[PDB]
C-alpha cells in the first residue's frame, strides 16, 4: 500500500537508540512512530523478521500446548489440580516471555519511549520464563521433600524478582551491558545446580541419573551456556559482518534456542509427571 511506505536502511543512519549491533550492516527498519507500519513490517524482510516470527510462532505453539495440557484427562495425573497449576505457571511464563519478545521486536522502531518500555518487558519476560520453568521441576524433584521445595521456590522468586528489578535499569539496555544481561540471565537458570546438588546428595547418583535428571540437565545447561555465548559473543555476525543481517544472526539463533530450550525443558518435566503417575502419590 501507499501508506507508511518505508525502506531498509544501513546501520550508520540509525538513531543511537536503534543502534544495537554494529555487525548487522544493512536491512534495518527506519524509526517509524506508527504501530500500523510496525505491525505490517512483520510481513516485510528486515533485520527483525526472523526474530518476530520465531517467537510469534513459538508463542501460539506454547499457547495451544498450554490449552491442550489443561484439557488433559484428570485420570492421567495423580494430583490433577496441583500438576495443572504447576505446569500452568510454566506456560504462563513461556507464553508471556515469547509474547513480550515478538511484541518488542515488532514495536522496536516506534519511538525511544516505546523501545525503552518494550525492552524492559522483553528482559523481564525471560526472568518470568526461568522462574516459571523451575516451579514444575522443583515440585517433582522435591515431591516427597516439602521443606526444600518451598525454600528453593523462594530463592528462585527473589533471584528472579532481582533479575526483573535489574532489567528496569536504563544502563542495563546499553550494548556494553550485553555481557551483563547474558551473565544475569545465565546465573538465574544456572542457579539450577543448588537444587540439583541437594537432590543428588539425597536421592543418589544412580537414582538421579536413572531418571534422566542428568541427561536432561546437561542438555539444559548446554543450551543455557551455548545459547548465552552466542548472544554475548555475537556469533556468527562477529565474523561475516553483512550476509548475516537478515538470516541466522546471534539474536535469531538465540531466539531459536529459547523456543527449543523451553520445549526440551517441558519434555523433561512432562516425563517427571509421567513417572510420578506410574509410581503413584506418597512416599515409603
Amino acid at each position: 500500500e501507499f501508506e507508511g511506505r518505508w525502506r531498509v536502511i544501513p546501520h550508520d543512519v540509525l538513531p543511537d537508540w536503534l543502534k544495537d549491533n554494529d555487525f548487522l550492516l544493512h536491512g534495518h527498519r527506519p524509526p517509524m512512530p506508527s504501530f500500523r507500519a510496525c505491525f505490517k513490517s512483520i510481513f516485510r524482510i528486515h533485520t527483525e523478521t526472523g526474530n518476530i516470527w520465531t517467537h510469534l510462532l513459538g508463542c501460539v505453539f506454547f499457547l495451544c500446548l498450554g490449552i491442550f495440557y489443561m484439557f488433559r484427562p484428570n485420570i492421567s495425573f495423580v494430583a490433577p489440580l496441583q500438576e495443572k497449576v504447576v505446569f500452568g505457571l510454566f506456560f504462563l511464563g513461556a507464553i508471556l516471555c515469547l509474547s513480550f519478545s515478538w511484541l518488542f521486536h515488532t514495536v522496536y522502531c516506534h519511538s525511544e519511549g516505546v523501545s525503552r518500555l518494550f525492552s524492559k518487558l522483553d528482559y523481564s519476560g525471560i526472568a518470568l520464563l526461568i522462574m516459571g520453568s523451575f516451579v514444575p521441576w522443583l515440585y517433582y524433584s522435591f515431591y516427597c521433600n516439602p521443606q526444600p521445595c518451598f525454600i528453593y521456590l523462594i530463592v528462585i522468586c527473589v533471584l528472579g524478582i532481582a533479575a526483573i528489578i535489574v532489567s528496569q535499569w536504563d544502563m542495563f539496555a546499553t550494548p556494553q551491558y550485553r555481557g551483563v544481561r547474558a551473565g544475569v540471565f545465565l546465573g538465574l537458570g544456572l542457579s539450577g545446580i543448588i537444587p540439583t546438588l541437594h537432590y543428588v546428595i539425597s536421592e543418589g547418583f544412580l537414582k538421579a541419573a536413572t531418571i534422566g535428571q542428568i541427561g536432561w540437565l546437561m542438555l539444559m545447561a548446554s543450551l543455557y551456556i551455548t545459547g548465552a555465548a552466542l548472544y554475548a559473543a555475537r556469533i556468527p555476525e562477529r565474523f561475516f559482518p553483512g550476509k548475516c543481517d537478515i538470516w541466522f544472526h546471534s539474536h535469531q539463533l538465540f531466539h531459536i534456542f529459547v523456543v527449543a530450550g523451553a520445549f526440551v525443558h517441558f519434555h523433561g518435566v512432562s516425563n517427571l509427571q509421567e513417572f510420578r503417575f506410574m509410581i503413584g502419590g506418597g512416599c515409603s
Partner: single-chain antibody
Amino acid sequence: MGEVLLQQSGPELVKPGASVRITCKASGYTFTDFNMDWVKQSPGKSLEWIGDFNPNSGGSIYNQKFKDKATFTVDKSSSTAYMELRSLTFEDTAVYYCARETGTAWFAYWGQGTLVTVSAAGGGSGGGGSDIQMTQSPASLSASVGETVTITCRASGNIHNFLAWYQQKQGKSPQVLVYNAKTLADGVPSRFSGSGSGTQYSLKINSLQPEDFGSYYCQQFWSTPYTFGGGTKLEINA
C-alpha cells in the same frame, strides 16, 4: 565521503515548449541506499512534491499533477539522479529540488535548487490539490528576539506522526528541523520542539534568535502524494 551533498545543475532559461533535464549529483553515501525526491517551489509559493525515485529498483512514483510533465531517470554509475520536464509553460518557472529520503520520506538533505525560467522574450493547464491537505497556522508572524512562537499543522486525515518540519532562508533550500513529529534532527538547536498526535501537530521555537527568520513548512510522509503545508513566514523584529 565526509558529508552528504546533493548538487544540481545551473540555472535554466528556456523557450516555452522546450524540455529540461535537471541533474542531482549525490555524494557522501551509497547512492542506491536511499530514495531521491523531487520538489518544486514556484516563486513566492510553497513546496510541491513532484515524485520519488528508487535508484536501486529503478521504480518511480509520481504525483498525478506532474504525471505528464516530469520523468525520473538515474545513473547508478555516475551517482546522479535526473528529472526531465517537458512541454514547459510559464507556470513551470520554479525552483526544482532533489531531496534525499532516509528510511521514511522526510528530507534530511536538499540540493541547492535549479531555477527553470520559461521565457518567450527571445521569440497551459492549472494545478490541482489531492488527498491529504496540510493546513498551517499562522500564514505569517513576527516576534521580537527571545520570544516563544508556536506553529501548527493540521492534516485532513490521520498521518500517524509521519510529519517533518522545515526551515527555509531566502533563496536557499529548506533544511529539516523535526522528523517523526517529535524527533529533533542533528545540529538543530534545542529551541525547536515538535509535538503532536493524530491530525494536529505543532512546532514550538523557544527564545527565538536572529538566525530564526525564514519560512517554515510541514510535510506529511504517511500517504502518497506527499504534501507540504502552505508555510509560515517568520519575521524577527528583535
